[PDB]
Every structure is written in C-alpha cells, then in structure tokens.
Design an enzyme around this catalytic site. Structure first.
Site, PDB file in Angstrom:
ATOM      1  N   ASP A 109      64.519 -52.941  19.440  1.00 38.55           N
ATOM      2  CA  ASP A 109      64.169 -53.750  18.049  1.00 38.55           C
ATOM      3  C   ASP A 109      63.545 -55.945  18.271  1.00 38.55           C
ATOM      4  O   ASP A 109      64.232 -56.608  18.417  1.00 38.55           O
ATOM      5  CB  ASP A 109      65.524 -54.222  17.417  1.00 38.55           C
ATOM      6  CG  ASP A 109      65.240 -54.755  16.101  1.00 38.55           C
ATOM      7  OD1 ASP A 109      64.054 -54.906  15.620  1.00 38.55           O
ATOM      8  OD2 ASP A 109      66.195 -55.684  15.290  1.00 38.55           O
TER       9      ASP A 109
ATOM     10  N   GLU B  29      59.909 -50.591  20.773  1.00 37.58           N
ATOM     11  CA  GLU B  29      59.120 -52.097  19.891  1.00 37.58           C
ATOM     12  C   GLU B  29      60.225 -53.068  21.223  1.00 37.58           C
ATOM     13  O   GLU B  29      61.222 -54.353  21.041  1.00 37.58           O
ATOM     14  CB  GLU B  29      60.880 -52.129  18.363  1.00 37.58           C
ATOM     15  CG  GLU B  29      59.847 -52.082  17.409  1.00 37.58           C
ATOM     16  CD  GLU B  29      60.496 -52.207  16.222  1.00 37.58           C
ATOM     17  OE1 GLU B  29      61.472 -53.836  16.718  1.00 37.58           O
ATOM     18  OE2 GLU B  29      61.523 -51.795  15.494  1.00 37.58           O
TER      19      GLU B  29
ATOM     20  N   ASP C 111      61.772 -43.086  18.168  1.00 38.86           N
ATOM     21  CA  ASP C 111      61.673 -43.061  16.924  1.00 38.86           C
ATOM     22  C   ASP C 111      60.652 -43.165  16.515  1.00 38.86           C
ATOM     23  O   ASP C 111      59.760 -43.319  16.224  1.00 38.86           O
ATOM     24  CB  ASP C 111      61.624 -45.268  16.680  1.00 38.86           C
ATOM     25  CG  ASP C 111      61.622 -46.031  16.168  1.00 38.86           C
ATOM     26  OD1 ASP C 111      62.113 -44.932  14.806  1.00 38.86           O
ATOM     27  OD2 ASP C 111      62.307 -46.986  15.802  1.00 38.86           O
TER      28      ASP C 111
HETATM   29 MG   LIG Z   1      62.953 -52.833  14.924  1.00 37.28          MG
END
Ligand SMILES: [Mg+2]
Length: 246
Positions: free
Chosen positions: A11, A41, A151
């Site tokens: 993230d 990310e 992901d």
């Molecule tokens: Mg994210």
C-alpha cells in the site's frame, strides 16, 4: 527441498506513516526470510527504502514510476536468469505482469506477480488481465515451475462465475483445503489503515501455480502486528507460502 515466498500489497499509495510502515514490512520480511517476495503498490521512495533495508534481496520492479509491483529475490538462494514485463494494454492503472525467471536449488522457476485492475466496476478488465496471467502461466515450459502470486483484486465470486481456474492451474489456498486462518488477506474489521467502520473482507491476494513436482506445504498471514503509529504495515495482510519441490 523447499521454497518459501511472501506476497504482499504494501500500500505505497497511502502516504501516511509510509517510512515506518516500510520498516514494518521489512521487519516482517526479516522474520520469515522468504526466498522470494512479491510486492504490489510499491512506489519509488519505498523501493529505495527497500533497496536500503532489505539488502539481502535483489529487487526487480514492474515499473520505475507511479506505483508498481516488485519481486525480491533472496541473495545466495535465488539466482536471477531473466525478467519480462507483459503489458496489460487496456489497464487504466499502469497494471502489468512481472515475470522473473530464476534458478532456485536445482529447479527452474518462473515467478510472476501483478496487481490486477482495482475496484468493482473494472471487473471485466480484471478478468481479462487474469486471463492474460493464466495464458502466460500456460506458455512456460513443462520443465519450469510456474508460480504467480499477487493482488488479484478478485471479488464477487468472479472466478467461479467465470468458469473457474484451468485444470492445470492450482490455487495454493484451495490446494491446502481452504484454511480459514488465512482466507482473507484484506480485512477492514481486523485492519484499520483505511479507517473503514464497515466490515469488508476479501481474498484479494492469491497464489497460482503450474507444475507436474510442486506441493504447497503451508500458507500463513503476515503483517498482523500494529506499528508505533498504531497502524499496520498495509491495509492488506501479507501471504507467506511454503512449498515442496519433488
Ligand atoms: Mg493500496
């Protein structure tokens, strides 16, 4: 022999507490010392921070700008042979398929990661990207062990609603009999980084593999301890997987 890897959306698009969170991710990685880490990310400063603190890992990136995936290879354990970035022509989010051919032990591996198109409304594109990933997994030689971990952003029973995975492509979580202790890798009830009061959970993060010679031994969540800032390393949990090669 055995191989182990972690797959993790860390993230980097959340700019709050990011260095501390990077330190968190790296402490987590340091604890388990996986042969391979699939990251999603990632952003450039995060990547630099990884190059600094995760010094025992060779870093390959799916891009140099914006945000992108990465594959970390344990030095001394994993020998890099080659990399290949397969584009997703219709991605609106710079998404692609990062492939790294490596030698591990005496076995040839094709290591793959992607961060498939996000959000519900981009289901179609996400499925097409998944199909691309699967096709690429099919492309590899029978001698090579193919491992995708990433992901997938998959939700709403998209996979089974689309006919399910091909016969020779296995989901590690499914293969291990769908344990519930590591079923959900994104969880707004347990994780508070997004600060969402409503409880949502999905198995976004998934591991696909193709081999004749590859048996998943274990699957675990990681990154489940809060940091000094009172937040987790990411809004996602990481997935630690260990597999036997025979
Ligand atoms: Mg994210």
């Amino acid at each position: 022999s055995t191989i182990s890897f972690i797959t993790w959306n860390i993230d980097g698009l959340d700019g709050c507490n990011l260095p501390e969170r990077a330190r968190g991710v790296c402490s987590c990685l340091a604890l388990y010392s996986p042969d391979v880490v699939f990251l999603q990310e990632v952003i450039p400063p995060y990547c630099a921070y990884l190059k600094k603190r995760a010094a025992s890992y060779t870093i390959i990136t799916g891009n140099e700008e914006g945000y992108f995936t990465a594959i970390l290879l344990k030095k001394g354990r994993v020998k890099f042979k080659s990399q290949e970035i397969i584009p997703f022509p219709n991605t609106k989010m710079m998404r692609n398929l990062l492939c790294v051919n490596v030698s591990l032990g005496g076995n040839e591996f094709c290591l793959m990661t992607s961060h498939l198109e996000s959000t519900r409304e981009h289901s179609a594109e996400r499925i097409r990207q998944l199909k691309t990933v699967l096709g690429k997994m099919q492309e590899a030689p029978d001698s090579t062990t193919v491992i995708f971990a990433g992901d997938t952003n998959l939700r709403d029973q998209e996979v089974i609603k689309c006919g399910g995975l091909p016969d020779n492509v296995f989901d590690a979580w499914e293969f291990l009999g769908k344990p519930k202790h590591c079923q959900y890798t994104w969880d707004t009830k347990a994780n508070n980084n997004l600060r969402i009061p409503a409880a949502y959970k999905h198995r976004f993060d998934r591991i696909f593999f193709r081999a004749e010679h590859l048996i998943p031994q274990s699957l675990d969540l990681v990154g489940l301890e809060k940091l000094d800032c009172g937040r987790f390393p990411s809004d996602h949990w990481g997935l630690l997987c260990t597999l036997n090669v025979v």
